[PDB]
Each structure stands twice: as structure tokens, then as C-alpha cells.
Write an enzyme that holds these catalytic residues in place. Structure first.
Site, PDB file in Angstrom:
ATOM      1  NE  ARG D  29      -3.512   0.506   2.981  1.00  0.00           N
ATOM      2  CZ  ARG D  29      -3.372  -0.478   3.858  1.00  0.00           C
ATOM      3  NH1 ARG D  29      -2.225  -0.690   4.484  1.00  0.00           N
ATOM      4  NH2 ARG D  29      -4.409  -1.270   4.117  1.00  0.00           N
ATOM      5  CB  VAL D  35       1.624  -3.522  -5.203  1.00  0.00           C
ATOM      6  CG1 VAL D  35       2.338  -4.671  -5.899  1.00  0.00           C
ATOM      7  CG2 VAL D  35       2.045  -2.192  -5.798  1.00  0.00           C
ATOM      8  CE  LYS D  46       1.625   1.985  -9.350  1.00  0.00           C
ATOM      9  NZ  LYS D  46       2.925   2.673  -9.578  1.00  0.00           N
ATOM     10  CG  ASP D 135      10.561   8.901  -6.264  1.00  0.00           C
ATOM     11  OD1 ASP D 135      11.402   8.535  -5.416  1.00  0.00           O
ATOM     12  OD2 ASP D 135       9.348   8.627  -6.151  1.00  0.00           O
TER      13      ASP D 135
END
Ligand SMILES: [Zn+2]
Ligand SMILES: [Zn+2]
Lengths: 166, 262, 129, 313, 488, 67
Positions: D29, D35, D46, D135
Site C-alpha cells: 500500500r 500492489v 498495481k 524520485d
């Protein structure tokens, strides 16, 4: 996708350009430099064409006959350029300062690697950049027999050695 | 993904032969001739261009929307989905994917209605009877059935590279840019790689303005027969556009339009 | 041309006027254009007999063979050359003499798996044998 | 838009719930979505947050459609449901997450050597295709386990990834926050609106230091104080005045030798300026990987995995 | 000078892995290792690819054996049957390129101690059945006599080019689109590629060289045929206008009507080749020997105007794509029947004249065609429509014995005279190429000119000039005829 | 058209593959022309066949059967 041809590995206009539409990572582009104004005001993007970039003009006259004639001239001239002009007979010449080493006796270990590579399978073009030349012309036959070099490749070394002596 | 066209999805699957285009367009040709279909495609490309220009969009986003528009109809019937709704949803998806930002709901609806009522009133006497939910479901369907290929390459980068290489940038760039803008009316984007189209446009631009470019084109190594075909297609476009009027005919063609059933 | 076979052998081992008047009308009377050697069925009557050959070769009434066929010279080039046995026997004649000799020779010339034959024809397909 | 086209598309389509047992057994989560472990009637299925397609979903689909690499995750199929208007993706299952390895150990040197080498080559490949990840977190690095391929770290969860080939708008005009403050680069933390590709280099350096010390180097102006504390203050871009030695001691406190090959690379990875920061390709050329034992394709190299399988929620 | 100029052929240098079967005799074993070591060098010196053996190293990739043919077969099948069924020091510096986006051909070299051969070929029949389909699709057999190794190079260059030409790289069975979505243009190509009607083992043909193009789109199919030494089989061969395709066929006609069915099967085979393309074709049919008097009747029925037009419409019904564009339907635009035979009447002596001496070091060819009307000033017209002489200095190969039966004296003269005749000439079926001209003299000079051009494809790279006279298709058909004759 | 003009003699000691160009041989002797690469004609026709779906050819064993 076998029917379509790809120009990925074929450079276009090689002296001034690489692959046609493949874009490598240039180290001096506009997306990496950071000026004082670039950080503050952000990326400054200006239209590629001044004025109206969206606007497309079709009122200007076109002459298809002139364009066809010019294209025919270009292709005819292009064909002429790619013709491999004839050259007169001349003896082969090689630059001795780089293509080999003058004295073989510098190291015995390097000879073993090179002749083991002669009996190998890599193309003769790679071996053309560095060949060994002995003090006498007789010992090369003895070394060739040790590695059992195929007679087709053994005769090539003889030609190169004769080219050096000439 | 960018910088490698020959491994991208736009080239592996979305480059189609002319035979497939002729075969898949038979169903749309059962009601209209080739000329009427071609004129309709040109008209809707113009509508997409105007709609993009009204929303203060760039040129790359409009080109991407036009490419999306053409791809959907190339392999599917024209009566499946109303093109008047195809245009705004393709523009919205192109703006969303090209990192320009998502337009507002009322903004998009007002822009579409205003454009249709100010510059296409003759073609559509009535208003634009659609809501944002229809646009959302249509773009969701389009993303579903287009194999999720959202990156479209353009001839603009090769054109700028070639003009910078040549050296001249003021006398040739506007003409090349407008020729590249005009060539989107045809199906060349679906037929040939972008750099061939860029080369053909550059050749047309340099020939028109009387510049000696023979020495430049001589040295480059590329197939010199397909460029002639692209030149022929562009010349046919420009010759057929000479005696074509939107206002006089589009009413009649869209009167013959095959509309979808409820 | 024998030295090579011999040395190969070595390498292998160690490691009355009336009579002559009629003849001139049959044997030497045939003097025809050599361009028409490559000829076939008579177009006029769709047969392998025509022109004036009806008197040189042993009824049916052919009419006015305008073309250049000559069955006397047709039998010369169509006896042993590569031809279908069905076509060849028409030129000579089964009922007449020499028809049995052709049939007897053909049978005497004769006296396995399908996939073997397919392999055989694949080896000869290349440019070089 | 007529009934026959819809019914034909429905006939051509296949239902995700009719092929996979995605129900229950949720395995992850997060803010990206949910997922689950799934199998045909093992993969990671997902479901993305939000009805319809958002910017994150559009970027995800438009990026992993054309990217392929042994060190980069690759979706096998996508499902699109019209009843609820949401998106479903199907990646290959990755049992082990780097966050799990970090948590379990709170450690072979060859393991971290090879892991760093693989992440550097993967990020170099990503930068080659002219795209920014924007990221890099220890939870975004996944490791295969006891399958056809061992180790083989995979970069994933690049919802924030954006192409930087040519920006029509400044990169900070549509995304004020790009990554969590634990790994935010100083350049963007100083209010920079046009940032280069070197931010991911800072992120990989930070996470490499985290694995070196088995503890987060940066922990929580909230992170600016920690940034100034860990490696001092720059005494040699905007709001320069509005803001109003340490590294060696910090590394020593974690029983790491100040004079070594890893320390030099770590020090040169983190700089206050983008120009002097090393790029991805030079990282592999560092003889740190060449020293002693060399990097391995298999991180475990025959050792048994002590980390347990990912648990359900 | 192929190796000196470092030229490269067509087909992208197909890679070959080889296995050699040799007896356990020291004299014959030692020669095998040196011969194939030399073969690898000449194969790679020419840009023909890689000739390395099977990657498993078992004493230089040579498999040994052990009346004795039985011993030559047990190990032949028991061994080769099942057989065919983390430190990186230098890699640290360079990063991996990526996943990015043709298995090597297997050739089994057979040494023949016998000075029958089928006994040796029986391995290949047994091996193919006991093999998985994907491995079997690319497996070839080559037989080399043992006398080459022991006793007496132009053999190596011929063997290297022969091995490369026989590879026949198969067409891929997958497109690797990776649709990852329900449906799209990529899926449409994939599901069309696996349709049941698509044939298997396409086996595209790529030769070392083809004729250069000479300035709508069409193609010309050159087909020639002749019967074997017994009339049981019809041997046929075909080639393209530029030598791009080369295929052969064998048709069984063995009845104890007999030839009309045989000719129908041949016409089906020719129709099978044109219909696999997507462009209109032109058909020119050749006969190695003298045309018969019934074959002309049968061919006139098959190659009639009404018939050739009928199959154009039948094609349109089956295929939608052919319906829209006529420029893509593989219809037939013209047909032609030509027979080649010697003359035996004229002789030219090159010694008598009136810088280079032609017969000694060069090959020449002259032609002369005339309408050959029967008199001066329904389906079939006159027997020879047009005739043309074919004077060639270059020697012709070993022709069948019945070819020279009429005039055996002309067999041995160095400048050969050959006669080419026209028989059908069906022009412009669909309704300017020479084949569509009503002047029958223009047709021959086009066919004979292409007959000469196709004869240059026979130039052995180890030889200075063309090995044999006439078209390439005629030459292969002749090679096939003798191969069937010798072994049967 | 393309005839033959002269013959040249070259010693066999000058013909080696080490040098990249042809020193004794001249490309103009053979009338060499460099032309750009194209997709093979045979390969392309296979791709364009996918849109046709003509009749399936015989299994190549249909010919070697009794009449
Ligand atoms: Zn007659
Ligand atoms: Zn068809």
C-alpha cells in the site's frame, strides 16, 4: 519488422553528422547549463521561427517543373560523385613509423601472443596494424611451423615482410 | 523515450505501408470517393489546428494531437466515433501527455463551442452537444485501443539540426517550418520516418528561394528515391489545395457524412 | 588428358539408269530451308503430315498446305531427341515398323523413398554443384 | 459512438478479474496505488489511485511502454476497466525490496558493491534515453529472488518521471515538490526552478551512504539544518540570504575508515554545486569497483537469502 | 579478387556451425583437421560470416565413427541424433547497452571413403525425423570425397561459396511487437502472420551476387524444363529477371492424358510462385530440347488468352486487397514459349580474321533474330513465329545426350551455334515492354538478351570466366538431370 | 555498351589484404559505382504478402505422387 530498413547504424553525412535521427548525449547542450537567469526565471524557450510559427503559407507560387529539374540535376550529380575515379598503377606503400615494430627481440612473450593470433580467426585487417619483422628471413618459417598457421594466412605474412624490406 | 527512434514504439508498430492504408479505408470509401475523404481529412486537420490555436497551445502539442487523430482513423471506420468529438479529446490527450498541463473542463468546453460557432458555423449549424464525461470516456477508449503509444516523434528536431548544419537560419527556417506544418494534412507522418520528411521540406524550401544546395545534398548518404516520392506527395497536396473551398463544399460533404447510430 | 587419370590411379594405389533415276527423286529431292528445322504440327490441317510429304512417306485428303512443314525432316529431328513417348510414337507409328523398337528400348532402359528425392533436389538447387 | 463498436470491443477485451486472482492478499500500500500478488487462473498487479487517468498514470504508461532494460522494470500487460474508470498494470513480481534489506539488518561488501554498480548502470541507461526519474528512494529499488534471474535490481515506481528532451514550460512550474524531503537535492531545496539531471546523482549518493552506514544519513529548514550539519556549510541558487570537516567525523562515527576507496566516491558524489558533481558514466570508471573483488551480476552469489518474503497487509 | 578488395555478399554473412564425420584412420583424420582449418580461414577472409564449429569443444569439432556403412550409420544416428536435440574483469569499465531488440545454420560435413553414396545420405533421412522442428528447420548436409584431403586452392573458394548459398535463412515466425494491450496494429500483423493458410519453411534465398538493375513495377519469371533420361519425371527450374530467386521442381509422370496431367501440374507449380508475390508478373517458358508436336497443343490450351484472363478474375474474388488496387494483384500480363536446340549447319572459325584475342581469354556472344515468315510477299498460327541464332564462344556445360543427337558434329566445335524459336507469344493479357509488342522479332531479342545476362551468374569466383553457357536456370536444370541420372 | 578494352599484368607479390584500399588494383578498371543500401526485393514481397491471403501452396509432396 524485417521488411522495413533501419538507418540506426548507418551515419548520415559522416564528416559533420552521426546517425540520422538518433540523438546522443551532447555534453555542451542548452539543457545542462545553469545561468543566473535560467535558475531564477526558469527555462527560457523562444519560438523556433519569429512571428507566427503555427501559420502555414500556401499562397506562394510553386513550380513543379523547376523542382523536378533541380532534383534530377542533384541525383545525376550525386551519381557522378559516387563513381570511384580510376587511379594509375602504383606500388603499395605503408607508413613504417606505426604499422609495426622494427626490432622483434624486444620481448619473446609478445611474439607468442601474435603468432597464436595468426593461427586464430580474427581478420587480417586487425593484424595489419602491427606485424613482426625478424633480423633474418629464415626464422619466420620455423616459428610459423610451431603454431601450424594455415598456409593461406602464412603466405600473407611473407607478403607484408617483403613489403617492409622493399 | 527520446533520442533513439529506431527502437521506439512509434517506429516498430505505427509505421504502416500504403497498401494497408488503402485496404483499411475501403469501409469509409463505400459512401464517399477518395477526393471527398481527402477533403474531409484536410478539413478536420484544420479544425484541430484552429482548436489548438484558440487555447494558446504550442505547435508540438497540436502536431501530436493531429498524429493521434490520424492514427485512430487509419485502422478504424470513420462512422465509429464522431470526429467532431474526436478532435477535442485528441487535443486534450496531447496536451496531457506533452507535459503542458491539463486544461479545465469549462475552459475546454467553452473553447470548443466558441471555435465551432465563430469559424465553423456553416459546417455545424447547431451547437456542440457534448459534455466532459463523453470526452473522458472517449479518451479512455482511445488510450485503450491505440496500444498505449503516446510518444510521437516529429521532423522539427531533424529540420533544426539540418538547417543549423547548413548555416543559413533566417532565409530558410520559416519556409521549412511552414512546409512541415502543411505536410501534416497528408498521411506522410504514418508512412515515412520524420527525417525523410524534414529533408524533403528543406529541399523544397531551398529550391523555392533559389539557393545552391546541390553540394549539400550530394554528400549525404540516404535513399534518394523515397525523397522524390515525398516531394511528389507534397506537390500533389499543394496543387489540389489550389481549387478547394471550405465554405462551398464542406456543407455538402458533411451532409453525406455517415453518422453513428444511437 | 590421360596423364591425370593415370597419376590419380597411382596416388590411389600407394596411399541401271532407271534405278538411279528414281533414287534422285527420293533421296536428293529433299532440299528444304534449314530455318524451318524447328517446326511442329501443320497449322493448315492440325496434323503431323502435310505439304508434298504425302508422296515421300507411306486415303486422307489434305488440302493446300501453305505453311512450311515437312514430315520428312520432322522424323529426322524427332526420333531420339528429348520428347514425350506419346508424341514420339505419333511421328514414327506404332502399327508400322520401328514402333516396337522404340517401345522395347524404353522398357529396357528401366530394367526410393519420397523424402529421399526431396533431399536430392535440394542439393542441386545451389548455384554450384 | 454506437452499440456495435462497444460490444465488439467488449468481446475483444478480457477481464482482469476473470484471468487473475488479484482479490485479497494485498502485498503493498502506498500513495502510488495498491500492489497485489496475482497469478493466472507470479506477477505484481498495481492499481493506480484516482478515477480515470491522471498525470502520474499517463507518465507511467507513456514511459514504460518504450523503455526496456535488464535493470529497469517492464510491464507485461495493462487492463482498462470502464465500469469504474481506473487503470491496472501488471509487472513481473519482485520479491525483495531494498527497504526490507535495510530494515532486516537494523552485510557483505561485494553485495553493496554490485548493487551500487547495477543501480548506476541503470540510471545511466535511463539518462541516455533523455528522461529524468525525479524520485530515488530505497523503497523504489527491488531485487529478484530465487527465480530464473537472481539479484538483478530493478528500478520502478517512476510515476514522477518526466522527459527533459525539450521543456515547453519550466520544470518547477508544474511540480513544486518532486521527491521526499529525505532525499531532496540542495539545488531544488534552494528554490531552483530549472534543475539539471544531477539531482538523481545526489539521490543515489545519499542512498549509497545509507547502505554504507546501514542508517539514514539524513534524518528529521527541516532538512536544510541536517544538510548543513552533516557536511558543513559551503564557504567557497535563489534566496541566498533568506536562509539566515563534519562529513569525516560523521563517517568515522559509523566505523567507516576515512581513508578508503568508497569514501572518496561518496564525498565526490555529494556536492553543493551541480557543475562539479560527477555524472553517471564516470561513476563506473571509478577504480572503487575495480579494487579487490569485483562486482557480480548475482548480488547474493550463492548465499542463502535470510530476508523473509514480503508479507500481506 | 573478392578477398583482396574485401567485398561482401548479399544475405548478411550467415554464420555456420559444422560437424565432421571422419573414420578412425590417422592418415585421414590428420588431413581433415588441416582442410577445415583452411576452410575456416577462406570462409572468414571473404565477408561470408563465421565458420566456427559447434560451440561445444570436442577435439576441434570432429566426430569419429567406430558392410562398414552399417558401422557408419549406428554411431551416425545414435550420437548426432540426441546431440542436435560471475567474474567479468573487462566488463566493469563499459556499461551495458541494453536489451535492444537468427540462429546459426548447422552443416554436417560428410567424408566419403568410398571411391553407394545413398548409404551416406541415409543418416540425414534418419536424423531429421528424430529432431525438434525448430532445430530441423535449419540443418544441411554436405558430402566431400576423401580423395580431396589425401590427393590434389580453387576448391576451398568453391566450397565456401557453395556452403553460404545453401544456407537459405528461414523467415522469422514472430514479430516481437510486445503489444501489452488488448489490440492494435501490432497485434493485427501478428495474428495475420500465424494464419493457417500461410505456408511454413519460407526459406528465403540470398545469393552472393545478383545482376545490377537497368533503367509501373513488374517482374519476369524464367522457367525451363526437360524430361529425365526416362520419361517418368519432369525436371523444371525457375529464376527471376535479376536472378533473385532460384527454385527447382520434380514432377512424377509414371503411367503403365499421361502428359496433359503432367503439364497441368507444372503450370500449377509456376502459378504457385507468382501468387506468393504482390506485383504483376510476366511469364517466359523455356524448353531445353526440341518442342514436341503435342506439347505445343497442350501449352496453347493452358497459355490461352481466355484462360490467363480467367485466373485474373478468380484472384480478385479470394483477396480483398487485390480487388482495390490492380497494381498489387499478382496477375499475369504476358506469356511466351521458347525452345532452344542446336543448329549443326553453320560453323565459325575464330582463327580466321577478316588487342585481345577473344576465344583464348574472353567470352563473347552474338545474336540475330528475324521474323522467319513461311511465305513471302485458330489458337496457333505458324509453327516458328520468330527465330534467332545464339553464337557463343564460351563452352556449354554437359548437356543431355539427346540434345546433340540430330547434329553430333556440332557438339565439339568451340563456338557453339544454338537456335531459339518462338511458339506462343500471348501479348497483353490484361488488356511499353518488348514482351507486349506484336512484332515477334522484338520478343526474341529481349528473351535472348536476358538469356545472355542470366548466363553471367554462372561465373565461378575461383574461375576467370563463366563456367558454362546459357541462362542460369538452364544450367541448374542440367545439373539436376545428371545428378538424378548418375545416382539412379 | 559495357565492352572489354585492355588487360593488365600485376606481379602476385603486390596482392595482400593488409592495406585497406587497393594499391595495385584500381576501382575504375571494373567501372565501379557505389550505390546506397536498400531492403532486399525478396524480403519486402514477403511482408506485403501478409495483407493478401492467397491460396495455400502445395506441400511440395503433391507433385511426387502417382497420377
Ligand atoms: Zn501446312
Ligand atoms: Zn491477394
Amino acid at each position: 519488422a524485417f521488411g522495413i530498413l533501419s538507418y540506426e547504424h548507418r551515419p548520415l553525412k559522416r564528416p559533420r553528422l552521426g546517425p540520422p535521427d538518433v540523438y546522443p548525449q551532447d555534453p555542451k547542450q542548452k539543457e545542462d547549463e545553469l545561468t543566473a537567469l535560467n535558475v531564477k526565471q526558469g527555462f527560457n524557450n523562444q519560438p523556433a521561427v519569429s512571428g507566427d510559427e503555427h501559420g502555414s503559407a500556401k499562397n506562394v507560387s510553386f513550380n513543379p517543373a523547376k523542382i523536378s529539374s533541380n532534383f534530377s540535376s542533384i541525383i545525376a550529380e550525386k551519381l557522378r560523385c559516387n563513381t570511384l575515379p580510376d587511379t594509375g598503377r602504383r606500388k603499395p606503400q605503408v607508413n613504417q613509423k606505426d604499422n609495426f615494430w622494427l626490432v622483434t627481440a624486444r620481448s619473446q612473450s609478445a611474439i607468442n601472443t601474435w603468432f597464436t593470433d595468426l593461427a586464430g580467426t580474427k581478420p587480417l585487417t586487425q593484424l595489419a596494424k602491427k606485424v613482426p619483422i625478424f633480423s633474418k628471413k629464415e626464422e619466420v618459417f620455423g616459428y610459423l611451423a610451431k603454431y601450424t598457421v594455415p598456409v593461406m594466412r602464412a603466405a600473407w605474412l611473407i607478403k607484408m615482410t617483403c613489403a617492409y624490406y622493399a | 523515450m527520446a533520442g533513439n527512434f529506431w527502437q521506439s514504439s512509434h517506429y516498430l508498430q505505427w509505421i504502416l505501408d500504403k497498401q494497408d492504408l488503402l485496404k483499411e479505408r475501403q469501409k469509409d470509401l463505400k459512401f464517399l470517393s477518395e477526393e471527398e475523404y481527402w477533403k474531409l481529412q484536410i478539413f478536420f486537420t484544420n479544425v484541430i489546428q484552429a482548436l489548438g490555436e484558440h487555447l494558446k497551445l504550442r505547435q508540438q502539442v497540436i502536431a501530436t494531437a493531429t498524429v493521434y487523430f490520424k492514427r485512430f482513423y487509419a485502422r478504424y471506420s470513420l462512422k465509429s466515433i464522431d470526429p467532431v468529438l474526436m478532435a477535442p479529446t485528441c487535443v486534450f490527450l496531447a496536451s496531457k501527455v506533452e507535459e503542458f498541463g491539463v486544461v479545465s473542463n469549462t475552459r475546454l468546453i467553452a473553447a470548443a463551442t466558441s471555435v465551432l460557432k465563430t469559424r465553423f458555423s456553416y459546417a455545424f449549424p447547431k451547437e456542440f452537444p457534448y459534455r466532459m464525461n463523453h470526452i473522458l470516456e472517449c479518451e479512455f477508449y482511445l488510450l485503450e485501443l491505440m496500444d498505449c503509444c503516446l510518444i510521437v516523434y516529429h521532423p522539427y528536431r531533424p529540420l533544426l539540426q539540418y538547417v543549423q548544419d547548413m548555416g543559413q537560419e533566417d532565409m530558410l527556417l520559416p519556409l521549412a517550418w511552414r512546409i512541415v506544418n502543411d505536410t501534416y494534412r497528408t498521411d506522410l507522418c504514418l508512412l515515412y520516418p520524420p527525417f525523410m520528411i524534414a529533408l524533403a521540406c528543406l529541399h523544397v524550401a531551398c529550391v523555392v528561394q533559389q539557393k545552391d544546395a546541390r553540394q549539400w545534398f550530394a554528400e549525404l548518404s540516404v535513399d534518394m528515391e523515397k525523397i522524390l516520392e515525398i516531394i511528389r506527395v507534397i506537390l500533389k497536396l499543394y496543387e489540389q489545395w489550389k481549387n478547394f473551398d471550405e465554405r462551398k463544399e464542406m456543407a455538402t460533404i458533411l451532409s453525406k457524412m455517415p453518422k453513428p447510430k444511437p | 588428358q590421360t596423364v591425370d587419370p593415370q597419376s590419380v590411379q597411382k596416388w590411389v594405389k600407394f596411399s541401271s539408269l532407271y534405278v538411279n533415276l528414281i533414287l534422285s527423286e527420293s533421296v536428293m529431292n529433299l532440299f528444304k530451308d534449314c530455318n524451318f528445322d524447328s517446326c511442329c504440327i501443320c497449322v493448315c490441317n492440325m496434323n503431323i503430315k502435310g505439304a508434298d510429304v504425302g508422296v515421300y512417306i507411306p486415303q486422307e485428303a489434305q488440302y493446300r498446305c501453305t505453311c512450311g512443314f515437312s514430315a520428312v525432316m520432322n522424323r529426322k529431328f524427332g526420333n531420339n531427341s528429348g520428347l514425350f513417348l506419346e508424341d514420339e510414337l505419333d511421328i514414327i507409328g506404332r502399327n508400322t515398323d520401328c514402333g516396337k523398337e522404340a517401345e522395347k528400348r524404353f522398357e529396357a532402359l528401366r530394367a526410393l523413398s519420397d523424402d529421399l528425392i526431396l533431399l536430392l533436389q535440394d542439393q542441386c538447387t545451389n548455384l554450384f554443384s | 459512438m454506437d452499440y456495435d463498436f462497444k460490444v465488439k470491443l467488449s468481446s475483444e477485451r478480457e477481464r482482469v478479474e476473470d484471468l487473475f486472482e488479484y482479490e485479497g492478499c494485498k502485498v503493498g500500500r502506498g500513495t502510488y496505488g495498491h500492489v497485489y500478488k496475482a497469478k493466472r487462473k507470479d506477477y505484481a498487479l498495481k492499481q493506480i489511485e484516482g478515477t480515470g487517468i491522471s498525470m502520474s498514470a499517463c507518465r507511467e504508461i507513456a514511459l514504460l511502454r518504450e523503455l526496456k532494460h535488464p535493470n529497469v522494470i517492464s510491464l507485461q500487460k495493462v487492463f482498462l476497466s470502464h465500469a469504474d474508470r481506473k487503470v491496472w498494470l501488471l509487472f513481473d513480481y519482485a520479491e525483495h525490496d531494498l527497504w526490507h534489506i535495510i530494515k532486516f539488518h537494523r552485510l557483505p561488501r561485494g553485495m553493496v558493491k554490485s548493487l551500487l554498480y547495477q543501480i548506476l548502470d541503470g540510471i545511466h541507461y535511463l539518462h541516455a534515453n533523455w528522461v529524468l526519474h525525479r524520485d530515488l528512494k530505497p523503497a523504489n529499488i527491488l531485487v529478484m529472488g530465487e527465480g530464473p534471474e537472481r539479484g538483478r535490481v530493478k528500478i520502478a515506481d517512476m510515476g514522477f518521471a518526466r522527459l527533459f528532451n525539450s521543456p515547453l514550460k519550466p520544470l518547477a512550474d508544474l511540480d513544486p515538490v518532486v521527491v521526499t524531503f529525505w532525499y531532496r537535492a540542495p539545488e531544488l531545496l534552494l528554490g531552483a526552478r530549472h534543475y539539471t539531471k544531477a539531482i538523481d546523482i545526489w539521490a543515489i549518493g545519499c542512498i549509497f551512504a545509507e547502505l554504507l552506514t546501514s542508517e539514514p544519513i539524513f534524518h528529521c529548514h527541516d532538512q536544510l539544518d541536517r544538510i548543513f550539519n552533516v557536511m558543513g556549510f559551503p564557504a567557497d541558487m535563489p534566496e541566498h540570504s533568506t536562509l539566515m570537516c563534519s562529513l569525516i567525523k560523521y563517517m568515522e562515527k559509523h566505523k567507516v575508515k576515512p581513508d578508503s576507496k568508497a569514501f572518496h566516491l561518496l564525498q565526490k558524489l555529494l556536492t553543493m554545486d551541480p557543475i562539479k558533481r560527477i555524472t553517471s558514466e564516470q561513476a563506473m570508471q571509478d577504480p572503487y569497483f575495480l579494487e579487490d573483488p569485483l562486482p557480480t551480476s548475482d548480488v547474493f552469489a550463492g548465499c542463502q537469502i535470510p530476508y523473509p518474503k514480503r508479507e500481506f497487509l | 579478387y573478392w578477398e583482396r578488395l574485401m567485398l561482401e555478399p548479399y544475405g548478411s554473412q550467415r554464420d555456420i556451425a559444422y560437424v565432421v564425420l571422419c573414420p578412425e584412420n590417422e592418415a585421414l583424420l590428420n588431413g581433415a583437421k588441416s582442410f577445415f582449418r583452411d576452410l575456416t580461414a577462406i570462409y572468414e577472409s571473404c565477408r561470408l560470416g563465421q565458420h566456427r564449429p559447434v560451440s561445444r569443444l570436442l577435439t576441434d569439432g570432429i566426430m569419429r565413427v567406430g558392410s562398414k556403412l552399417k558401422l557408419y550409420a549406428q554411431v551416425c544416428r545414435y550420437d548426432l541424433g540426441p546431440y542436435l536435440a560471475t567474474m567479468d574483469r573487462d566488463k566493469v569499465g563499459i556499461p551495458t547497452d541494453g536489451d535492444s531488440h537468427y540462429p546459426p545454420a548447422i552443416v554436417v560435413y560428410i567424408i566419403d571413403p568410398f571411391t553407394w553414396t545413398l548409404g551416406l545420405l541415409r543418416c540425414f533421412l534418419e536424423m531429421v525425423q528424430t529432431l525438434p522442428p525448430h532445430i530441423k528447420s535449419t540443418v544441411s548436409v554436405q558430402i566431400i570425397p576423401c580423395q580431396y584431403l589425401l590427393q590434389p586452392p580453387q576448391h576451398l573458394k568453391s566450397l565456401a561459396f557453395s556452403a553460404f548459398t545453401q544456407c537459405r535463412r528461414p523467415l522469422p515466425t514472430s514479430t516481437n511487437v510486445k503489444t501489452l494491450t488488448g489490440f492494435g496494429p501490432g497485434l493485427a500483423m501478428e495474428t495475420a502472420l500465424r494464419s493457417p493458410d500461410r505456408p511454413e519453411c519460407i526459406r528465403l534465398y540470398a545469393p552472393p551476387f545478383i545482376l545490377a538493375p537497368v533503367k509501373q513495377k513488374y517482374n519476369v519469371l524464367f522457367v525451363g524444363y526437360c524430361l529425365s533420361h526416362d520419361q517418368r519425371w519432369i525436371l523444371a527450374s525457375c529464376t527471376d529477371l535479376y536472378g533473385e530467386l532460384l527454385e527447382t521442381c520434380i514432377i512424377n509422370i509414371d503411367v503403365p492424358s499421361a502428359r496433359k496431367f503432367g503439364l497441368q501440374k507444372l503450370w500449377e507449380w509456376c502459378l504457385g510462385l507468382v501468387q506468393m508475390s504482390s506485383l504483376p508478373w510476366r511469364v517466359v517458358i523455356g524448353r531445353l530440347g526440341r518442342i514436341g508436336h503435342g506439347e505445343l497443343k497442350d501449352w496453347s490450351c493452358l497459355l490461352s488468352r481466355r484462360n490467363l484472363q480467367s485466373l485474373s478474375k478468380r484472384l480478385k474474388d479470394m483477396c480483398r486487397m487485390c480487388g482495390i488496387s490492380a497494381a498489387d494483384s499478382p496477375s499475369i500480363l504476358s506469356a511466351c514459349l521458347v525452345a532452344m536446340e542446336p543448329q549443326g549447319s553453320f560453323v565459325i572459325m575464330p582463327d580466321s580474321v577478316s588487342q585481345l584475342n577473344t576465344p583464348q581469354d574472353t567470352s563473347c556472344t552474338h545474336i540475330l533474330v528475324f521474323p522467319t515468315s513461311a511465305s513471302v510477299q485458330p489458337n496457333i498460327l505458324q509453327q516458328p513465329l520468330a527465330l534467332g541464332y545464339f553464337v557463343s564462344t564460351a563452352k556449354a556445360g554437359p548437356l543431355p545426350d539427346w540434345f546433340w543427337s540430330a547434329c553430333p558434329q556440332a557438339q565439339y566445335q568451340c563456338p557453339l551455334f544454338l537456335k531459339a524459336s518462338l511458339h506462343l507469344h500471348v501479348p497483353s493479357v490484361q488488356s511499353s515492354h518488348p514482351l507486349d509488342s506484336n512484332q515477334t522479332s522484338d520478343v526474341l531479342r529481349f528473351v535472348l538478351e536476358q538469356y545472355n545476362a542470366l548466363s553471367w551468374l554462372t561465373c565461378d569466383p575461383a574461375t576467370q570466366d563463366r563456367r558454362s553457357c546459357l541462362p542460369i536456370h538452364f544450367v541448374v536444370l542440367n545439373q539436376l538431370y545428371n545428378f538424378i541420372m548418375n545416382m539412379l | 555498351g559495357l565492352q572489354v578494352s585492355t588487360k593488365q599484368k600485376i606481379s602476385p607479390w603486390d596482392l595482400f589484404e593488409g592495406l585497406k584500399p587497393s594499391a595495385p588494383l584500381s576501382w575504375g578498371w571494373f567501372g565501379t559505382v557505389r550505390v546506397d543500401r536498400r531492403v532486399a526485393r525478396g524480403e519486402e514481397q514477403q511482408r506485403l504478402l501478409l495483407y493478401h491471403t492467397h491460396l495455400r501452396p502445395r506441400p511440395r509432396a503433391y507433385y511426387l505422387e502417382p497420377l
